[PDB]
Amino acid sequence: ARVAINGFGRIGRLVYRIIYERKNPDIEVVAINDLTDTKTLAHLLKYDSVHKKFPGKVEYTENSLIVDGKEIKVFAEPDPSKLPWKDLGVDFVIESTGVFRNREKAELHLQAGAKKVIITAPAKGEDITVVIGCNEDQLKPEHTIISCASCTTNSIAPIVKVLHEKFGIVSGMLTTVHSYTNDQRVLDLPHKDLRRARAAAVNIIPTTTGAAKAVALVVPEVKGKLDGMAIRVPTPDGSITDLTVLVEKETTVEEVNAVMKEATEGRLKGIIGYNDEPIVSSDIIGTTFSGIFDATITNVIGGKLVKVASWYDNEYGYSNRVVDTLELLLKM
Amino acid sequence: ARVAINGFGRIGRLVYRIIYERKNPDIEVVAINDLTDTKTLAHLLKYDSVHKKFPGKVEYTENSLIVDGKEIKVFAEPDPSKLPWKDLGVDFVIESTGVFRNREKAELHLQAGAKKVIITAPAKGEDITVVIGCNEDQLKPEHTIISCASCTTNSIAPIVKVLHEKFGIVSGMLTTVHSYTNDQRVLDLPHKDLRRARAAAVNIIPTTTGAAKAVALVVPEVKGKLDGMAIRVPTPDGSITDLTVLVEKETTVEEVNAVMKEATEGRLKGIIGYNDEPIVSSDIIGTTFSGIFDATITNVIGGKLVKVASWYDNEYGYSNRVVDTLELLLKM
Amino acid sequence: ARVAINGFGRIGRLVYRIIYERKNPDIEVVAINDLTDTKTLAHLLKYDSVHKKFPGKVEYTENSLIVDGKEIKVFAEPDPSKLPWKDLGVDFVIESTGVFRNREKAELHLQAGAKKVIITAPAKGEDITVVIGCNEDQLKPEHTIISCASCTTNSIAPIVKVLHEKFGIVSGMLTTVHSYTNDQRVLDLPHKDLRRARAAAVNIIPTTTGAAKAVALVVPEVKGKLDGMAIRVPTPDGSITDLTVLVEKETTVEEVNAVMKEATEGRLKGIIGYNDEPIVSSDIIGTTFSGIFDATITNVIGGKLVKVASWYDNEYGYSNRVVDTLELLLKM
Amino acid sequence: ARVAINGFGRIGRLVYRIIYERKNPDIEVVAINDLTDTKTLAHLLKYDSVHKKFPGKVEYTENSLIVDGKEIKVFAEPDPSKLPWKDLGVDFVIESTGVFRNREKAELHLQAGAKKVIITAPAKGEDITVVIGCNEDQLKPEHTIISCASCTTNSIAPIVKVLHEKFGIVSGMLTTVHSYTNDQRVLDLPHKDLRRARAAAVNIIPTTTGAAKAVALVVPEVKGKLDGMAIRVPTPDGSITDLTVLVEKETTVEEVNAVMKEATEGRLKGIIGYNDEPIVSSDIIGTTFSGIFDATITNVIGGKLVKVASWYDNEYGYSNRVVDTLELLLKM
Ligand SMILES: NC(=O)c1ccc[n+]([C@@H]2O[C@H](COP(=O)([O-])OP(=O)(O)OC[C@H]3O[C@@H](n4cnc5c(N)ncnc54)[C@H](O)[C@@H]3O)[C@@H](O)[C@H]2O)c1
Ligand SMILES: NC(=O)c1ccc[n+]([C@@H]2O[C@H](COP(=O)([O-])OP(=O)(O)OC[C@H]3O[C@@H](n4cnc5c(N)ncnc54)[C@H](O)[C@@H]3O)[C@@H](O)[C@H]2O)c1
Ligand SMILES: NC(=O)c1ccc[n+]([C@@H]2O[C@H](COP(=O)([O-])OP(=O)(O)OC[C@H]3O[C@@H](n4cnc5c(N)ncnc54)[C@H](O)[C@@H]3O)[C@@H](O)[C@H]2O)c1
Ligand SMILES: NC(=O)c1ccc[n+]([C@@H]2O[C@H](COP(=O)([O-])OP(=O)(O)OC[C@H]3O[C@@H](n4cnc5c(N)ncnc54)[C@H](O)[C@@H]3O)[C@@H](O)[C@H]2O)c1
């Protein structure tokens, strides 16, 4: 399968690295599109402020990138419809710019010639939002516009599902203490959200989270029961979802932790990790899990109010899931 | 009343500034004790990384500080019992070192000659823990060892009280996204708490909060119902308490916000502020409130699960309360 | 005189706050143009992450800001030629967008009807670059497109003049340890400068400084003898210029300091401050000086190689100079 | 040879991790002494905020660390004279506590039974200060109390030697933009140095550097010609030395670079690296070099005033040199 990445930013670049690291024979990234030159994309791929140096040899010509001797065409076409997908024989497009999340816009890749599109964020009018650990068995070959939801949703949806199935979720609220992203501002600058307009590394910033409504999409049984928010803090990568749910059946920290441990060893293996050590955010950077269930934080008040917490590398854990979904598509 | 400050650190210094700013005729700070020289204390009082320059003229001799022409004796006596309180005619001592929180240790000031001691943190074996907005009408002249609780407790106890009185609190959990303090570490260094041992400005650090058990002390009706934790983040000052409570009577965001607004205008006036603007942490630095109720964050799920959030300048808001308590003592 | 501010960003906003504080009757700010709406501009004017809350009352309508009952029209015109300067009766325009630095662009404001334009950055094709303390006396009424140079130039040029005057300059190099700005990035993102493309708050970033060339524009005598670079670091505001200069006359630390103190009490009074206390960056935020000579850093080796440093609030010290220049055009 | 590490801090821990990575058979680390317990030392060895997880398996008993099945005894003896070096058969001790820098203190390890002591900082009364790339050939078997100087000295001294060699040095000044360290403070707290007393992560802090004097210890020829200072900034690791030097011979940027590249491919191979890409601090974390010559910063004005810069991972580049010195004593 020939793959194309639209938007070689934080997610687009890490998705490429992961693909390069996996060495899957059936996945060939043939093109990369952004709004800049090959020199700049080469440099940004090579050096990373959070994730260290790219393992491979990176070179560039005026029109392409050369990674370990393989040439990848680079374009700077802000309009997806102008992209030579059809000509390049492009099968799947990873939509990671952040601006083409509506079905109408994403559809432009299919018009330009690609078969399926994966939007690396919550979407509007998509065929399906797939969160591995929740509903990847609903994906069908007829789905062309696919969404992988947000990082916070992947960090907690699989956990919400097991808690619901074991104790029954009545009401619930999550708060994600999240690192800043390129959607924020260095210093106070205009932005649609007046809080995200404020200096990123200087403030504790309450704002919104895609997880709020996305979880109900993958775990329908919980629709209308959960809500949430985000508090962006001065860390460049690494987050933690703090979930408080009112459950139906009585429990204990001991039991909640045991069911989770079971899950991470089984159905959730490699998706949700299990931790019982006093770790901090810098310790989870580079992990591939969608979330790491922190057993040292589990708490129950009155047998029914329970707090559970999930750590996650918002950039890396998520990109891994994007590549998994891409592999899912190789099976149809 | 002649007052003495033991521990001229972040809290000790701000308490002095506030006292200096209030210009209360009946409060004379006659001594300051620490573990350093007058030159260093003079400099630290004068320049502050978070709160700006001290308004007054500060000078120093080998044995004292001279603020606007008034001399304040300075000692470097690590043992409170050796302090010349009796001789100096010291009435009230502000215990702000952080190491004399047990009744036995605090009692040393009374042995050295002072009448009453105010511990600026949760205490052990104290006569009374007073949180203004919750139980300042329990303070009696027979109380010599007084505690003002922690900053997080003052940020939320007054709010917890009104919520309980209006809707009835069943179960509840709070999480405080808190700035780092001098109890943490610049870079990974030994500490009793393995998470607080980690680099302060580089990590999202879950840890403990004094508010967890201190709230039940001032609002007895809620004993055994609330629990909580802290997540220290890379900001030098400014915090927010995120409380999620299961309430008895059905409500709405509209109602919860209205009762709070009423309170801030009444009984809680000047203690708990009310906000409905999209502010961030840097905007609350320098406020005197114990907490600022953020109306833009209030949320209710299923008429009974409610989230309320309180902002606070953990250094300044709290020191103001310490001075208020000191004034309370002038009335007996 | 009627004034308009083009680009209500960090500088644009600070210039206005200063104009408002000075209460100069001969200055009426009648228009403000940016690229966003009034609600956003009102919120950004009211709250600041570094400089705290605006002293006045701020309201807004669909097309104007109302500060203390006075109305300022607000436009969102990215093309200066389409601005109604002629109709608004705009005499002077403060060009602080950062994108209209060459004469061809700056002129669009004149074409639109304004009389004089002050660019808050180095320019190309300007009639004069004026650095108060260096060449303000070269300002002629015929000057129509004026530049105030950059903040680093203003922090060190007046000092360079004096030093050259007293000991004669042979060669010199300056390095400014500079707070980050909005020209930088939150996380690794494309930028012309590949170093400024990197995560601003987590890297020590070598880059360029507009003072490398501009110093000679205002102190012609040192033309071809200086050069410099910048090192952007993780602070939101506050910078320091480290100048190492090879002088002609034999000196001593004492004489350089004495010569500078002399200057700051006379000719450079209110422009360059004098310091001899061990202060750090947070201590100089809010200062009106262009630079604060730090006597504690002065060093001379071989009686001829001298080091001097100048602290400065890159946003606020500079904006005061922008407003000073504006006041100069008032007497013409 | 049996080795003991006194002070398992940033350097102590890194020196050990390197020893462990090199797998040198002639080096057996048999003891580790600090001021805390095994559980804390084990946790701090395992997780690192800057350098990531330890590669091996770490366990602990009440009095020892067990790494990959090997046991290291752990002591908590603040007085080196009371350490059982004689009984443990300790040949060499790595003195990394930062408090036993003078000969009188360092000797307590010899009194306790060790043969040779390597201090990881500038010292007083040492037999020799050795900077590999400068004077390692002056190390004699008779040397018993050795110093590896400071990280800044190691980053620039080898370069100073070469430059002096090729163009002759007349005068020079260095300024290192340095990451903060554990000698600093989280928030304003007493310290000998009134500037280092300030909040480490929120200020640009001028302070001292051990390279101001030490460079001459290893390059005697430049004795009395250099001086320097430090500027501590809000980064956890990564530093850069900015050297402005007045040379004797007329040069050009090209020749200085060529001369340095030459050196790094030969004599300084593996000690000083060569760089010509636009890298930032985060890019040099994890490097083994003492300094990385940055060709993109080299500048010469007047054919004689030259600027050169050297990047370095102050913790890790230095520790590799500490272990290299240790390996040198092996051939004696
Ligand atoms: N950063 C995270 O933690 C994270 C995690 C999960 C999902 N996401 C989502 O993935 C998407 C990408 O976010 P990011 O953090 O990588 O952002 P980013 O801003 O670093 O990357 C956006 C990239 O796309 C490019 N781009 C923008 N418009 C373009 C256009 N019209 N055509 C082609 N290229 C264009 C930009 O130049 C940039 O390089 C967003 O929707 C985001 O919400 C981000
Ligand atoms: N910082 C906050 O947000 C905050 C808020 C509320 C309460 N508190 C509490 O107030 C107390 C002080 O904390 P802080 O943040 O001001 O800390 P700090 O570490 O800045 O201040 C402690 C000061 O006391 C001095 N000291 C320590 N031991 C001494 C001794 N034996 N005798 C005399 N002086 C000694 C230290 O030199 C230092 O100057 C702590 O219990 C803390 O928990 C802190
Ligand atoms: N920040 C400092 O320390 C500093 C100091 C001295 C000078 N300057 C200079 O001042 C200028 C502005 O700097 P800043 O730091 O305030 O930047 P900034 O990005 O905060 O502000 C730029 C503002 O102008 C607006 N703008 C951009 N394009 C526009 C257009 N076409 N029409 C109208 N408005 C538009 C943007 O929305 C933004 O609000 C730059 O030239 C900069 O080099 C900055
Ligand atoms: N951090 C760097 O970049 C760097 C680089 C080169 C050299 N150094 C030098 O290395 C030394 C250690 O520096 P660090 O940054 O690792 O500091 P640090 O504070 O992390 O480590 C010091 C360690 O030694 C322990 N210690 C203190 N007193 C002790 C005693 N009496 N007995 C036994 N152990 C004790 C402390 O518990 C701590 O773990 C200092 O001299 C420093 O100047 C630091």
Side-chain angles (χ1 to χ4, degrees):
Chain A
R2 327 241 287 159
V3 174
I5 300 175
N6 203 47
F8 210 52
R10 305 301 293 159
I11 296 312
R13 238 141 57 218
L14 266 14
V15 160
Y16 174 74
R17 177 184 301 219
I18 295 164
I19 286 171
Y20 163 96
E21 295 184 327
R22 293 196 185 177
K23 291 189 69 283
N24 181 316
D26 306 304
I27 284 182
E28 295 172 58
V29 178
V30 291
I32 287 168
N33 181 51
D34 208 271
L35 303 171
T36 202
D37 55 41
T38 54
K39 185 199 175 76
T40 299
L41 296 185
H43 184 70
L44 292 183
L45 174 67
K46 198 186 169 194
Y47 299 104
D48 196 272
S49 294
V50 179
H51 303 289
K52 281 64 179 52
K53 266 193 69 165
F54 181 68
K57 169 155 66 73
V58 185
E59 303 186 294
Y60 62 93
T61 68
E62 182 193 296
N63 304 308
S64 66
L65 243 36
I66 296 176
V67 186
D68 278 353
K70 292 140 176 295
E71 194 157 344
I72 299 169
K73 305 288 184 48
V74 166
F75 306 89
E77 184 46 64
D79 178 6
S81 64
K82 306 294 173 41
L83 294 164
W85 290 169
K86 179 272 190 303
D87 175 64
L88 251 42
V90 165
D91 296 298
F92 314 132
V93 174
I94 291 175
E95 191 22 80
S96 43
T97 68
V99 298
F100 304 125
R101 298 159 57 169
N102 192 95
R103 188 167 229 267
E104 190 268 298
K105 250 55 199 173
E107 203 104 73
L108 297 179
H109 293 290
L110 308 185
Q111 182 174 124
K115 272 97 155 194
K116 298 184 180 174
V117 182
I118 306 174
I119 307 178
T120 67
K124 225 92 158 190
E126 73 285 355
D127 288 330
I128 188 190
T129 290
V130 41
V131 165
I132 297 191
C134 295
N135 71 342
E136 74 281 7
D137 56 71
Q138 310 275 253
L139 187 64
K140 304 171 186 67
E142 49 256 35
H143 296 317
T144 50
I145 313 302
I146 307 156
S147 171
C148 296
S150 68
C151 52
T152 306
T153 306
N154 284 82
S155 86
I156 210 69
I159 299 194
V160 162
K161 201 188 187 58
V162 168
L163 285 171
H164 174 71
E165 255 145 45
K166 239 73 178 185
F167 318 115
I169 288 169
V170 174
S171 298
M173 274 183 217
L174 67 280
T175 290
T176 171
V177 184
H178 198 299
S179 274
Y180 49 69
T181 63
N182 273 324
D183 188 63
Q184 285 179 252
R185 304 292 182 252
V186 178
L187 282 171
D188 306 345
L189 254 188
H191 189 299
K192 283 54 183 293
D193 182 325
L194 299 183
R195 309 243 225 204
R196 289 189 181 211
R198 308 298 292 287
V202 174
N203 300 294
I204 284 175
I205 301 173
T207 182
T208 67
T209 174
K213 297 188 180 302
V215 177
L217 275 180
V218 298
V219 180
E221 312 110 82
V222 93
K223 189 175 177 299
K225 297 174 181 179
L226 299 179
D227 208 348
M229 59 167 199
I231 291 181
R232 296 295 183 100
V233 295
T235 47
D237 190 25
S239 310
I240 186 179
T241 303
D242 180 5
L243 177 80
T244 302
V245 288
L246 177 64
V247 106
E248 280 171 43
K249 302 167 194 58
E250 171 118 339
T251 20
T252 61
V253 176
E254 292 65 55
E255 199 191 341
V256 171
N257 287 157
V259 39
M260 272 311 153
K261 196 186 217 300
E262 287 162 26
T264 68
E265 293 167 7
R267 192 206 309 187
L268 296 190
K269 187 147 196 51
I271 287 160
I272 298 294
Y274 188 85
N275 168 267
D276 56 24
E277 296 218 65
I279 61 163
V280 297
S281 63
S282 67
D283 301 328
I284 55 97
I285 284 172
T287 56
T288 56
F289 300 114
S290 298
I292 300 160
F293 175 90
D294 196 344
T296 69
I297 296 172
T298 307
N299 201 186
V300 183
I301 282 296
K304 292 183 188 172
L305 192 67
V306 26
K307 173 176 301 308
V308 116
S310 176
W311 287 102
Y312 58 113
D313 181 332
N314 48 279
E315 299 189 325
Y316 205 73
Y318 184 83
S319 303
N320 271 284
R321 288 307 82 76
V322 167
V323 185
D324 286 357
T325 304
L326 182 63
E327 291 175 338
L328 250 37
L329 299 185
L330 291 183
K331 290 222 161 301
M332 39 199 68
Chain B
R2 327 241 287 159
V3 174
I5 300 175
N6 203 47
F8 210 52
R10 305 301 293 159
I11 296 312
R13 238 141 57 218
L14 266 14
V15 160
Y16 174 74
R17 177 184 301 219
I18 295 164
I19 286 171
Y20 163 96
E21 295 184 327
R22 293 196 185 177
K23 291 189 69 283
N24 181 316
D26 306 304
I27 284 182
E28 295 172 58
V29 178
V30 291
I32 287 168
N33 181 51
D34 208 271
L35 303 171
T36 202
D37 55 41
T38 54
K39 185 199 175 76
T40 299
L41 296 185
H43 184 70
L44 292 183
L45 174 67
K46 198 186 169 194
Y47 299 104
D48 196 272
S49 294
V50 179
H51 303 289
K52 281 64 179 52
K53 266 193 69 165
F54 181 68
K57 169 155 66 73
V58 185
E59 303 186 294
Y60 62 93
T61 68
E62 182 193 296
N63 304 308
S64 66
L65 243 36
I66 296 176
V67 186
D68 278 353
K70 293 140 176 295
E71 194 157 344
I72 299 169
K73 305 288 184 48
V74 166
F75 306 89
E77 184 46 64
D79 178 6
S81 64
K82 306 294 173 41
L83 294 164
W85 290 169
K86 179 272 190 303
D87 175 64
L88 251 42
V90 165
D91 296 298
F92 314 132
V93 174
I94 291 175
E95 191 22 80
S96 43
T97 68
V99 298
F100 304 125
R101 298 159 57 169
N102 192 95
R103 188 167 229 267
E104 190 268 298
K105 250 55 199 173
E107 203 104 73
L108 297 179
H109 293 290
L110 308 185
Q111 182 174 124
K115 272 97 155 194
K116 298 184 180 174
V117 182
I118 306 174
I119 307 178
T120 67
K124 225 92 158 190
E126 73 285 355
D127 288 330
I128 188 190
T129 290
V130 41
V131 165
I132 297 191
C134 295
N135 71 342
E136 74 281 7
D137 56 71
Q138 310 274 253
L139 187 64
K140 304 171 186 67
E142 49 256 35
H143 296 317
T144 50
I145 313 302
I146 307 156
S147 171
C148 296
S150 68
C151 52
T152 306
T153 306
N154 284 82
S155 86
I156 210 69
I159 299 194
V160 162
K161 201 188 187 58
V162 168
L163 285 171
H164 174 71
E165 255 145 45
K166 239 73 178 185
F167 318 115
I169 288 169
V170 174
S171 298
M173 274 183 217
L174 68 280
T175 290
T176 171
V177 184
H178 198 299
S179 274
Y180 49 69
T181 63
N182 274 324
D183 188 63
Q184 285 179 252
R185 304 292 182 252
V186 178
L187 282 171
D188 306 345
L189 254 188
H191 189 299
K192 283 54 183 293
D193 182 325
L194 299 183
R195 309 243 225 204
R196 289 189 181 211
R198 308 298 292 287
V202 174
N203 300 294
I204 284 175
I205 301 173
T207 182
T208 67
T209 174
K213 297 188 180 302
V215 177
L217 275 180
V218 298
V219 180
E221 312 110 82
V222 93
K223 189 175 177 299
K225 297 174 181 179
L226 299 179
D227 208 348
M229 59 167 199
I231 291 181
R232 296 295 183 100
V233 295
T235 47
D237 190 25
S239 310
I240 186 179
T241 303
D242 180 5
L243 177 80
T244 302
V245 288
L246 177 64
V247 106
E248 280 171 43
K249 302 167 194 58
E250 171 118 339
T251 20
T252 61
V253 176
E254 292 65 55
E255 199 191 341
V256 171
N257 287 157
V259 39
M260 272 311 153
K261 196 186 217 300
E262 287 162 26
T264 68
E265 293 167 7
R267 192 206 309 187
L268 296 190
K269 187 147 196 51
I271 287 160
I272 298 294
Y274 188 85
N275 168 267
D276 56 24
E277 296 218 65
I279 61 163
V280 297
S281 63
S282 67
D283 301 328
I284 55 97
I285 284 171
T287 56
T288 56
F289 300 114
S290 298
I292 300 160
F293 175 90
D294 196 344
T296 69
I297 296 172
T298 307
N299 201 186
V300 183
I301 282 296
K304 292 183 188 172
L305 192 67
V306 26
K307 173 176 301 308
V308 116
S310 176
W311 287 102
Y312 58 113
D313 181 332
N314 48 279
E315 299 189 325
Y316 205 73
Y318 184 83
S319 303
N320 272 284
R321 288 307 82 76
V322 167
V323 185
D324 286 357
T325 304
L326 182 63
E327 291 175 338
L328 250 37
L329 299 185
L330 291 183
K331 290 222 161 301
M332 39 199 68
Chain C
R2 294 162 71 102
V3 190
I5 286 159
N6 198 49
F8 211 52
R10 300 303 295 158
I11 295 314
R13 235 138 59 225
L14 255 16
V15 161
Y16 177 75
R17 173 180 301 209
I18 302 171
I19 286 180
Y20 168 95
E21 289 173 342
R22 297 190 184 188
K23 294 283 222 65
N24 186 339
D26 308 314
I27 296 174
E28 303 146 80
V29 181
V30 305
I32 282 165
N33 180 54
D34 201 274
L35 292 175
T36 187
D37 52 56
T38 55
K39 177 180 164 43
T40 300
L41 288 192
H43 181 85
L44 292 167
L45 173 60
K46 193 189 311 195
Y47 304 106
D48 197 279
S49 290
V50 177
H51 304 288
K52 296 157 181 62
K53 248 215 63 69
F54 185 71
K57 162 168 159 289
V58 185
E59 300 179 298
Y60 65 90
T61 73
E62 290 184 19
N63 314 278
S64 63
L65 239 42
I66 292 167
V67 183
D68 284 355
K70 291 191 174 183
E71 201 165 328
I72 316 299
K73 285 195 178 65
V74 171
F75 305 88
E77 182 55 63
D79 184 356
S81 65
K82 303 207 211 77
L83 292 158
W85 297 155
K86 184 186 169 54
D87 311 80
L88 255 25
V90 174
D91 300 314
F92 318 125
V93 171
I94 294 164
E95 179 44 55
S96 42
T97 71
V99 302
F100 297 129
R101 291 161 59 165
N102 64 77
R103 180 173 242 280
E104 183 188 78
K105 293 312 186 306
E107 276 200 67
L108 297 180
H109 291 284
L110 304 179
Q111 261 90 278
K115 297 178 174 64
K116 296 174 172 195
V117 182
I118 297 171
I119 314 179
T120 66
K124 276 57 217 164
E126 80 286 351
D127 292 335
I128 186 178
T129 293
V130 42
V131 161
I132 294 173
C134 277
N135 63 334
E136 67 271 33
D137 63 276
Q138 309 266 68
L139 186 53
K140 304 299 155 181
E142 54 179 276
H143 294 320
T144 246
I145 291 179
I146 305 159
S147 168
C148 295
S150 65
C151 52
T152 301
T153 303
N154 275 264
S155 81
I156 205 65
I159 294 168
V160 170
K161 184 194 183 80
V162 166
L163 292 182
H164 168 67
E165 217 152 63
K166 272 59 215 309
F167 325 103
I169 287 172
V170 180
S171 295
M173 282 194 236
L174 76 281
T175 296
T176 169
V177 182
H178 198 303
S179 279
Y180 50 69
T181 65
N182 280 322
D183 188 55
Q184 283 176 253
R185 304 304 185 242
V186 174
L187 286 166
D188 305 350
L189 260 177
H191 188 291
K192 251 63 168 304
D193 184 316
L194 287 173
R195 305 233 226 211
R196 288 188 188 209
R198 314 291 297 271
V202 304
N203 293 294
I204 288 177
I205 304 176
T207 182
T208 62
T209 177
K213 311 193 68 60
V215 173
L217 284 173
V218 297
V219 183
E221 314 90 79
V222 77
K223 178 168 166 287
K225 307 169 182 161
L226 291 178
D227 212 341
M229 64 170 300
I231 296 199
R232 294 290 173 110
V233 297
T235 50
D237 197 28
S239 297
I240 180 176
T241 306
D242 177 18
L243 178 70
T244 292
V245 71
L246 179 60
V247 99
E248 284 176 49
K249 297 181 189 173
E250 247 260 346
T251 16
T252 59
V253 176
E254 295 80 16
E255 198 195 340
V256 171
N257 275 185
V259 155
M260 279 304 301
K261 193 181 191 321
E262 185 110 31
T264 66
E265 290 172 308
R267 46 131 61 98
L268 297 174
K269 192 193 179 63
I271 298 306
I272 302 296
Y274 190 82
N275 171 262
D276 65 2
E277 302 240 322
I279 57 171
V280 297
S281 61
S282 59
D283 295 331
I284 54 82
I285 286 178
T287 47
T288 63
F289 300 111
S290 295
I292 304 170
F293 178 83
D294 194 358
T296 64
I297 293 175
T298 306
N299 199 181
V300 180
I301 54 176
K304 313 270 220 188
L305 195 70
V306 11
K307 170 173 302 293
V308 293
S310 183
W311 289 101
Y312 58 113
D313 178 329
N314 48 276
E315 281 177 355
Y316 201 75
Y318 184 81
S319 302
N320 269 284
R321 291 302 84 75
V322 172
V323 177
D324 288 356
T325 304
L326 186 67
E327 293 192 318
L328 256 39
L329 303 189
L330 236 50
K331 291 89 68 175
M332 279 177 253
Chain D
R2 294 162 71 102
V3 190
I5 287 159
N6 198 49
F8 211 52
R10 300 303 295 158
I11 295 314
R13 235 138 59 225
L14 255 16
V15 161
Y16 177 75
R17 173 180 301 209
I18 302 171
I19 286 180
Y20 168 95
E21 289 173 342
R22 297 190 184 188
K23 294 283 222 65
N24 186 339
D26 308 314
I27 296 174
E28 303 146 80
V29 181
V30 305
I32 282 165
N33 180 54
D34 201 274
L35 292 175
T36 187
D37 52 56
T38 55
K39 177 180 164 43
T40 300
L41 288 192
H43 181 85
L44 292 167
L45 173 60
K46 193 189 311 195
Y47 304 106
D48 197 279
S49 290
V50 177
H51 304 288
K52 296 157 181 62
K53 248 215 63 69
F54 185 71
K57 162 168 159 289
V58 185
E59 300 179 298
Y60 65 90
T61 73
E62 290 184 19
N63 314 278
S64 63
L65 239 42
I66 292 167
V67 183
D68 284 355
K70 290 191 174 183
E71 201 165 328
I72 316 299
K73 285 195 178 65
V74 171
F75 305 89
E77 182 55 63
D79 184 356
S81 65
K82 303 207 211 77
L83 292 158
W85 297 155
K86 184 186 169 54
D87 311 80
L88 255 25
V90 174
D91 300 314
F92 318 125
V93 171
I94 294 164
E95 179 44 55
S96 42
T97 71
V99 302
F100 297 129
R101 291 161 59 165
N102 64 77
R103 180 173 242 280
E104 183 188 78
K105 293 312 186 306
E107 276 200 67
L108 297 180
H109 291 284
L110 304 179
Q111 261 90 278
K115 297 178 174 64
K116 296 174 172 195
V117 182
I118 297 171
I119 314 179
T120 66
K124 276 57 217 164
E126 80 286 351
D127 292 335
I128 186 178
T129 293
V130 42
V131 161
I132 294 173
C134 277
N135 63 334
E136 67 271 33
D137 63 276
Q138 309 266 68
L139 186 53
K140 304 299 155 181
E142 54 179 276
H143 294 320
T144 246
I145 291 179
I146 305 159
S147 168
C148 295
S150 65
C151 52
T152 301
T153 303
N154 275 264
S155 81
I156 205 65
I159 294 168
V160 170
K161 184 194 183 80
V162 166
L163 292 182
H164 168 67
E165 217 152 63
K166 272 59 215 309
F167 325 103
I169 287 172
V170 180
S171 295
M173 282 194 236
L174 76 281
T175 296
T176 169
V177 182
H178 198 303
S179 279
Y180 50 69
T181 65
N182 280 322
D183 188 55
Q184 283 176 253
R185 304 304 185 242
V186 174
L187 286 166
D188 305 350
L189 260 177
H191 188 291
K192 251 63 168 304
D193 184 316
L194 287 173
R195 305 233 226 211
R196 288 188 188 209
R198 314 291 297 271
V202 304
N203 293 294
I204 288 177
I205 304 176
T207 182
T208 62
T209 177
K213 311 193 68 60
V215 173
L217 284 173
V218 297
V219 183
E221 314 90 79
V222 77
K223 178 168 166 287
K225 307 169 182 161
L226 291 178
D227 212 341
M229 64 170 300
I231 296 199
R232 294 290 173 110
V233 297
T235 50
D237 197 28
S239 297
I240 180 176
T241 306
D242 177 18
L243 178 70
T244 292
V245 71
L246 179 60
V247 99
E248 284 176 49
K249 297 181 189 173
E250 247 260 346
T251 16
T252 59
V253 176
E254 295 80 16
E255 198 195 340
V256 171
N257 275 185
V259 155
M260 279 304 301
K261 193 181 191 321
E262 185 110 31
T264 66
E265 290 172 308
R267 46 131 61 98
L268 297 174
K269 192 193 179 63
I271 298 306
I272 302 296
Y274 190 82
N275 171 262
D276 65 2
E277 302 240 322
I279 57 171
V280 297
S281 61
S282 59
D283 295 331
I284 54 82
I285 286 178
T287 47
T288 63
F289 300 111
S290 295
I292 304 170
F293 178 83
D294 194 358
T296 64
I297 293 175
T298 306
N299 199 181
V300 180
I301 54 176
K304 313 270 220 188
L305 195 70
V306 11
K307 170 173 302 293
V308 293
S310 183
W311 289 101
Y312 58 113
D313 178 329
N314 48 276
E315 281 177 355
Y316 201 75
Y318 184 81
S319 302
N320 269 284
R321 291 302 84 75
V322 172
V323 177
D324 288 356
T325 304
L326 186 67
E327 293 192 318
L328 256 39
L329 303 189
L330 236 50
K331 291 89 68 175
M332 279 177 253

